[PDB]
Design a protein around this nucleic acid. Structure first.
Ligand SMILES: [Mg+2]
Ligand SMILES: [Mg+2]
Ligand SMILES: [Mg+2]
Ligand SMILES: [Mg+2]
Ligand SMILES: [Mg+2]
Ligand SMILES: [Mg+2]
Ligand SMILES: [Mg+2]
Ligand SMILES: [Mg+2]
Ligand SMILES: [Mg+2]
Ligand SMILES: [Mg+2]
Ligand SMILES: [Mg+2]
Ligand SMILES: [Mg+2]
Ligand SMILES: [Mg+2]
Ligand SMILES: [Mg+2]
Ligand SMILES: [Mg+2]
Ligand SMILES: [Mg+2]
Ligand SMILES: [Mg+2]
Ligand SMILES: [Mg+2]
Ligand SMILES: [Mg+2]
Ligand SMILES: [Mg+2]
Ligand SMILES: [Mg+2]
Ligand SMILES: [Mg+2]
Ligand SMILES: [Mg+2]
Ligand SMILES: [Mg+2]
Ligand SMILES: [Mg+2]
Ligand SMILES: [Mg+2]
Ligand SMILES: [Mg+2]
Ligand SMILES: [Mg+2]
Ligand SMILES: [Mg+2]
Ligand SMILES: [Mg+2]
Ligand SMILES: [Mg+2]
Ligand SMILES: [Mg+2]
Ligand SMILES: [Mg+2]
Ligand SMILES: [Mg+2]
Lengths: 155, 117
RNA sequence: ACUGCAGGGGAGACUGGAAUUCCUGGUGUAGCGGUGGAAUGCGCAGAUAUCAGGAGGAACACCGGUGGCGAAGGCGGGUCUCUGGGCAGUAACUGACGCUGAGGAGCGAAAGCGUGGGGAGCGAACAGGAUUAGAUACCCUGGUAGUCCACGCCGUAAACGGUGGGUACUAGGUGUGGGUUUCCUUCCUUGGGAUCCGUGCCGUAGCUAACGCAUUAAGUACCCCGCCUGGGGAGUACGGCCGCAAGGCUAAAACUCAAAGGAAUUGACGGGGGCCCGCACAAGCGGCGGAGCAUGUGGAUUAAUUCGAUGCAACGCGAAGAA
């Protein structure tokens, strides 16, 4: 807003998987306050991820996010009679936020039957660099690397 | 198939475009790759980014004719004027001296009328 | 008149360099150009670029300014020839010969006109592209008259300091252009003091409706000239004079309105400026707009659909209870 930056909220570690990255994942899956339901989806998907790799699934999940973190996004501006995008460097806390929105966001429209197995398959494909959430990592980068000429419009 | 060890690079930087040609000391063109040759069309040609890709496409095509050191003659009131001298350096050319040969008339010919934009 | 001095003041002839454009040729090859964004256009039959040579016209970077000159319009590349005016000093000379000037006469930016040259760049008209509801415009790409020269005509500008010319007087402060002259004076400082002539800014008395002017008066006085008498109709008509024409100069009335104006004050407004806020946008999550139903409303229907609410700030509102 006008008067400076706003405070951000702290997250407590998940009791099963000792990671801040998992409790930030269950908040993206959360709808309508159903947080015990959103925890059974995320726990049921990460335990379906060690039934196919054997490795502890927060190691899979940190590899799945490092393939869907963007580094250059495409914020817009109107200059004169024409409007065109300006590439900007993404600060590191937005990168985890925008990546976890893409995993949960594209797993709601995969073709399996339940949300547990849709979220499980999206983590395994993103860990290998395969799924649709990885495709928006480079569609963000292609649109940012086709507008290098507009990088002097840093506001 | 030519081989000239020392050259001269001319950079004309206008408000719409930049053109980087590279000659011998007698004034005979080796390569000339400009900002429209590198793929751009419209108002994008006048940005500083299209100048530092025009200067690379003329530098690493002058080296196929053996040019290892150029002199720099810049002229024009353009944006891409320092980003085309710094772009010849990071492509394998020694720059030496930099001169400004902007054609400055002694109040001769009459300019066009001013724009009511 | 003599002696010094400053200057784009004027006219004529010869002449200098940068750049714009075209031409001949070399190197080179696929784009150049243009805009808020684009297209028309140029180019692939060798453009743009880049180096060399040549043709031609116009304008004169730096010096250059807050500065100089001229009655005003205006005037700057260089040199030469002819030529106008001003300032200071000396006090040699004439002895009021002075000021203004009705009509008159000359000069008078730019556009335009006539005959004849010239034509690079710019560019009314015009043509195409764009924008747009349309775009006879702004913007883009071309482009004729014209801009230039010789000789004539025209005689108008916000021709402005919106302030006619001469003279005398009425505190100063501070820059600057042109002279002359005493002191520590040759310790150079070209500093300071005095004095005459310009050119600016700031300011007291004084004036003004106010803004403002103020020794360069719009102050205090005298002499001559042009002009004004409410706004429109109108610097138009008719008549005349001038012009090759465009048109210029002189110049009304009927009729119509009760105003038209000047300076300043408070606001509001601005596709004006400065700083600052708001779920205002941005960054996010969930909706409305499509479906079916409940409810209020517009319209229509009806014997009656009781009345009220109507942009935000009316429409699950007055109704927290219509068989
Ligand atoms: Mg002279
Ligand atoms: Mg003459
Ligand atoms: Mg020349
Ligand atoms: Mg020509
Ligand atoms: Mg040629
Ligand atoms: Mg050429
Ligand atoms: Mg001369
Ligand atoms: Mg006597
Ligand atoms: Mg007289
Ligand atoms: Mg008279
Ligand atoms: Mg005359
Ligand atoms: Mg004329
Ligand atoms: Mg005519
Ligand atoms: Mg003529
Ligand atoms: Mg003629
Ligand atoms: Mg035009
Ligand atoms: Mg047209
Ligand atoms: Mg008049
Ligand atoms: Mg004038
Ligand atoms: Mg007058
Ligand atoms: Mg007087
Ligand atoms: Mg004075
Ligand atoms: Mg004053
Ligand atoms: Mg008065
Ligand atoms: Mg009257
Ligand atoms: Mg008349
Ligand atoms: Mg008549
Ligand atoms: Mg007023
Ligand atoms: Mg006011
Ligand atoms: Mg305002
Ligand atoms: Mg929003
Ligand atoms: Mg609905
Ligand atoms: Mg009603
Ligand atoms: Mg309500």
């Amino acid at each position: 807003p006008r008067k400076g930056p706003a405070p951000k909220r702290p997250l407590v570690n998940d009791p099963v998987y000792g990671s801040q990255l998992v409790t930030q994942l269950v908040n993206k899956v959360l709808l309508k306050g159903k947080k015990s339901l959103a925890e059974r989806i995320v726990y049921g998907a990460l335990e379906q991820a060690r039934d196919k790799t054997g490795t502890d699934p927060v190691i899979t999940l940190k590899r799945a996010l490092d393939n869907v973190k963007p580094a250059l996004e495409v914020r817009s501006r109107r200059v004169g009679g024409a409007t065109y995008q300006v590439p900007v460097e993404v600060r590191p806390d937005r990168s985890t936020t925008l990546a976890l929105r893409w995993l949960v966001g594209y797993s709601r429209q995969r073709r399996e039957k339940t949300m547990i197995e849709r979220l499980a398959n999206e983590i395994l494909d993103a860990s290998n660099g395969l799924g649709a959430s990885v495709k928006r990592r480079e569609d963000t980068h292609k649109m940012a690397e086709a507008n290098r000429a507009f990088a002097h419009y840093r506001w | 198939k030519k081989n000239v060890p020392h050259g001269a690079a001319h950079i004309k930087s206008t408000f719409n475009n930049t053109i980087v040609t590279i000659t011998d000391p007698q004034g005979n063109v080796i390569a000339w790759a400009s900002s429209g040759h590198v793929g751009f069309k419209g108002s994008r040609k006048s940005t500083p980014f299209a100048a530092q890709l025009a200067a690379e496409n003329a530098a690493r095509k002058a080296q196929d004719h053996g040019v290892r050191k150029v002199d720099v003659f810049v002229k024009g009131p353009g944006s891409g004027r320092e980003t085309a001298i710094r772009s010849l350096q990071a492509a394998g050319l020694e720059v030496g001296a930099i001169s400004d040969v902007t054609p400055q008339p002694h109040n001769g010919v009459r300019p066009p009328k001013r724009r009511r934009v």
